[PDB]
């Protein structure tokens, strides 16, 4: 084994912004939250916004 194996991998910055945008959108769907293992069955609302 050599230390100069490719450890890091490049992604286009626009794909990364797409994924984070798509992952933020998924966090506003209560069904997707439940299917990922979150116990949000008594949360008042999704998205859940609290005061400053």
């Amino acid at each position: 084994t050599k230390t100069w194996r490719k450890w890091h991998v490049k992604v286009n910055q626009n794909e990364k912004r797409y994924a984070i945008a798509s992952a933020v959108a998924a966090s506003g769907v209560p069904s997707l939250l439940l299917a990922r293992g979150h116990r949000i069955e008594e949360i008042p609302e999704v998205p859940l916004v609290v005061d400053d």
Binding site: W4, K6, W7, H8, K10
Partner: protein, 166 residues
């Protein structure tokens, strides 16, 4: 001044006055040791412009080397070994004949207080100047390894530089 006359007389090395002195002193230097102490430089103009001052801590040594690597580089190294407590400042050519090339080497005592208290030669006291002639840091040593500025004069091309994101 008299160093203008001395230094323009040193360009006519085969003139009548210079040829007679070259042959007379070459015989005299051959009767002496291979490396012998010089009471004063035989070329007070050339030593003076190479960093020599007539003061305590400055030493001039003469050495003959056989003709036929750089001759001046070997003179600096041999004298440096002979006087291991001194720092080789510079060196120059004084005489030659059919067999020998004679050189005078300027050495500086890094332990003398007149050297350690003089800011203009204070630099030679630092340990990074231990055996400058041995590492090619003198004038002829630098010239020997082609150190200079210009087109007239390896590791970073035999290696693969692999970045993190590539």
């Amino acid at each position: 001044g008299a160093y203008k006359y001395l230094e323009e007389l040193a360009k006519k090395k085969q003139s009548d006055v210079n040829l007679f002195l070259s042959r007379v002193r070459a015989w005299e230097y051959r009767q002496m040791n291979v490396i012998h102490r010089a009471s004063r430089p035989s070329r007070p103009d050339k030593a003076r412009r190479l960093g020599y001052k007539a003061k305590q801590g400055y030493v001039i040594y003469r050495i003959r080397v056989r003709r036929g690597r750089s001759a001046r580089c070997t003179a600096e190294e041999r004298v440096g070994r002979y006087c291991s407590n001194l720092r080789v400042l510079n060196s120059y050519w004084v005489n030659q004949d059919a067999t020998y090339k004679f050189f005078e080497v300027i050495l500086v005592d890094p332990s003398h207080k007149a050297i350690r208290r003089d800011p203009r030669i204070n630099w030679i006291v630092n340990p990074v100047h231990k055996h400058r002639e041995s590492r090619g840091l003198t004038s002829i040593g630098k010239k020997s390894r082609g150190i200079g500025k210009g087109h007239r004069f390896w590791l970073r091309h035999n290696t693969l530089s692999l970045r993190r994101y590539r």
